[PDB]
Structures are given as structure tokens and as C-alpha cells.
């Protein structure tokens, strides 16, 4: 749309269900999954000006998308990452390697050296091993990369951004929840990690399920569905009810962010039927299985919703 609006003469095309393309003359747009699918000559075209939109999708060096993009080497490769580093500096290494392979060291040099934590000398001032004085080394790398990155803060031109609130609420674990938590903690240690596998790495999932939906802590929820969920087993549900009722009486359009869709459905059932107080509030639903057209329709409804 932007291509045909600002610059009609440009020959741009969609590599989703197109044809001709390389057979004809200039610009090509594709999907990352489409790029994976077209591992044919397409990778050998040597697109003079290569630009990737969702750089955040190639953060992982081992991800197939990032490596597939990497094989397509061109004299000018660019990334338009939606966000900078979020998880690890190896992501920045991968991005820079895609755009600037020879200007930065290999994976080892980076990890053993170019790592803000103790690897680079998080105590570079010979202070406590804690990473508090790790400067003049990571700062040097930041200054080296600055001549290769651009960033405009919304406040730079978009000062019209009302106040944000980092209001971290706090809840209390119920006696039932506390008992189950302690039981799991005592019984968690089988190999003490069992390579995670529902003990530490995904025992975190068990802990989260206890915290949120102890009432329906099972895959076979249908057996308990007639009598559960029960908010009495989770004070977080009580806090949610209080806030939702307050915002409904205050007429505020509220957004609720949830974990795996099981919790989503449990909350939906709670609000809809379990508590008549919340049943009075009209609500909307969304999930990862929602249709794209339905997703857009629901977004439009929310932007101008009569719901709560």
C-alpha cells in the first residue's frame, strides 16, 4: 500500500501466491515462512538491497528463519527489527552478523568477551563479582555499534503520551494453594531437576497453575467443570473481580492479559456464570485460534465497544 501510494512507478509484488516475479523485471516482498519454503534458486538471486522487517523474528542464531536469511548474502543487507535486544546479546550478534558479518567477531569472541555479565567483566572495576561496575568494555561495544543503529524514542516527537503506570499488584496465596505448593515443592525433587520436565523448568508451570487455577489444576477439567472453577481457591480471581467491578461502575474499558488458553477459558466461565456480579458486565473474548477477520472485527469492536 505504501509502495503504490508514495511511489506508484516502483515494481513491487507479493511473494505469497504470486507468479512471474523473477521472470519479469525491482522489488519483492515475501513472508519469512515463504522464504523458508523458497529455498530454491531464490536464495541465489543476490537481491542487491535486502531488508528484513521483523528482525525480532531472527533473534535466535539457531532459528531456521535467521539462518535462511543469512544464507542469502548480499552487499547490502538491512534489518528493521521492531524492537532491540530483549533476551540476550547473542541476538544482537546474530543481527549484526546478518547485516555486518565482518565488522564483529564470531560467536565465541562475542560470548566469552562481548557479554555485559561477568564474561566481559561485569566487575570491570575489579569490584564485587556482581555485575554493577561492568563498564568501559560493554560501553565500548555499545559505542562501536551506535554508528550502525538508529533509534527514535516516541517521546522525541510523540510527547503526547499520557502517563504510564507501573502498578504491580500483589496477591495472597490461599491455604489450599499454599498446601499444594508445599506438597509439590516437597515432592518435586526426584532427580532435583529431572532435566526440568515438570519439576523446575516446567514445574514452574505447575506452580503457576496452582497460583491461578488450583480449582481446575488438571487436564481433565470436565470432571470438575460442573463445580469449578472456584474463585475461593484463588485470591487473584477476587482481586480481578474487585478491579473489574470498580472499572465497570467507573465505565473504563479494561484489557485482561492471560496465559495459555486454558486459563483464558476458565476466566471466561468465571466471569460469565460463576459470579453474578461479574455476569452483569458485558465482555469480549480473544485467543490465538481466532480467525484473522474475526480478530480484526473484535479489535474494531473493542476500539468502540459498549462492553466492559
Partner 1 sequence: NQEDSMIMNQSSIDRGLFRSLFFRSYMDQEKKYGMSITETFEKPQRTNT
Which residues of the shown chain bind partner 1 in the complex (CB under 8 A)?
184, 206, 217-220
With CA atoms as reference, report the closest residue to 29 among 5, 7, 3.
Answer: 3
Q: Which residues pair with 30 in a beta bridge?
A: 15
CB 99 within 8 A of CB 79: yes
Q: What is the sign of the dihedral through the CA atoms of 106, 112, 118 and 123? A: negative
DSSP at 110? I
Q: Which long-range contacts (CB under 8 A, 24 or more apart) does 240-246 make?
A: 240/267, 241/275, 241/277, 241/278, 244/271, 244/278, 244/281, 244/308, 245/277, 245/278, 245/281
Cell of 302: 473493542
Q: Give the residue with the Cβ less far from partner 1, 3 or 184.
A: 184
Comparing CB distances to partner 1, the nearer of 94 and 174 is 174
Q: How far is the CB of 247 from partner 1 (least distance, A)?
A: 34
**Nearest distance from C-beta of residue 131 to partner 1, angstroms:** 38
Nearest approach in angstroms of CB 238 to partner 1 is 24
CB 16 within 8 A of CB 22: no
Q: Which is nearer to partner 1, 60 or 188 (CB)?
A: 188
Q: Nearer Cβ to partner 1, position 5 or 219?
A: 219
Breaks (C-N over 2.5 A) in the chain follow: 25
CB of 218 to partner 1, least distance (A): 4
Q: Which is nearer to partner 1, 133 or 221 (CB)?
A: 221
Q: Which is nearer to partner 1, 77 or 180 (CB)?
A: 180
Instruction: Report, in Å, the least distance between residue 232 CB and partner 1.
Output: 19
Whose Cβ is closer to partner 1: residue 48's or residue 187's? 187
Rounded distance between C-alpha atoms, residue 55 and residue 58, angstroms: 5
| Least distance in angstroms from the C-beta of 221 to partner 1 | 10
Work out how close the CB of 219 gets to partner 1 at its nearest, in angstroms, rounded to a whole number.
7
Q: How far is CA 219 from the centre of its chain?
A: 25
Amino acid at each position: 500500500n505504501e509502495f503504490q501510494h508514495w511511489w506508484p512507478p516502483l515494481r513491487t509484488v507479493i511473494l505469497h501466491s504470486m507468479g512471474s516475479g523473477m521472470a519479469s523485471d525491482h522489488i519483492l516482498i515475501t513472508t519469512y515462512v515463504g522464504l523458508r519454503i523458497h529455498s530454491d534458486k531464490l536464495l541465489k538471486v543476490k537481491w542487491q538491497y535486502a531488508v528484513l522487517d521483523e528482525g525480532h523474528k531472527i533473534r535466535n542464531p539457531d532459528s531456521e528463519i535467521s539462518l535462511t536469511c543469512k544464507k542469502l548474502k548480499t552487499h547490502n543487507r538491512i534489518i528493521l527489527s521492531g524492537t532491540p535486544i530483549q533476551n540476550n546479546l547473542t541476538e544482537l550478534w546474530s543481527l549484526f552478523d546478518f547485516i555486518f558479518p565482518g565488522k564483529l567477531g564470531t560467536l565465541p569472541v562475542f560470548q566469552q568477551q562481548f557479554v555485559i555479565p561477568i564474561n566481559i567483566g561485569g566487575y570491570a572495576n575489579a569490584t564485587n563479582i556482581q555485575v554493577q561496575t561492568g563498564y568501559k568494555c560493554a560501553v565500548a561495544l555499545r559505542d562501536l555499534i551506535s554508528p550502525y543503529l538508529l533509534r527514535r524514542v516516541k517521546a522525541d516527537v510523540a510527547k503526547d503520551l499520557p502517563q504510564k503506570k507501573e502498578m504491580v499488584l500483589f496477591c495472597k496465596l490461599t491455604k489450599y494453594q499454599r498446601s499444594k505448593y508445599l506438597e509439590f515443592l516437597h515432592s518435586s525433587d526426584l532427580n532435583q531437576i529431572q532435566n526440568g520436565k515438570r519439576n523446575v523448568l516446567f514445574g514452574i508451570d505447575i506452580l503457576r497453575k496452582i497460583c491461578n487455577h488450583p480449582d481446575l489444576l488438571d487436564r481433565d477439567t470436565k470432571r470438575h467443570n460442573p463445580d469449578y472453577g472456584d474463585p475461593k481457591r484463588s485470591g487473584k480471581m477476587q482481586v480481578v473481580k474487585q478491579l473489574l467491578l470498580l472499572w465497570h461502575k467507573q465505565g473504563y474499558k479494561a484489557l485482561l492479559f492471560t496465559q495459555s488458553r486454558q486459563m483464558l477459558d476458565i476466566l471466561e466461565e468465571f466471569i460469565s456464570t460463576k459470579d453474578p456480579d461479574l455476569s452483569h458486565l458485558n465482555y469480549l473474548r480473544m485467543d490465538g485460534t481466532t480467525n484473522i477477520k474475526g480478530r480484526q472485527s473484535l479489535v474494531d469492536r473493542f476500539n468502540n465497544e459498549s462492553f466492559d
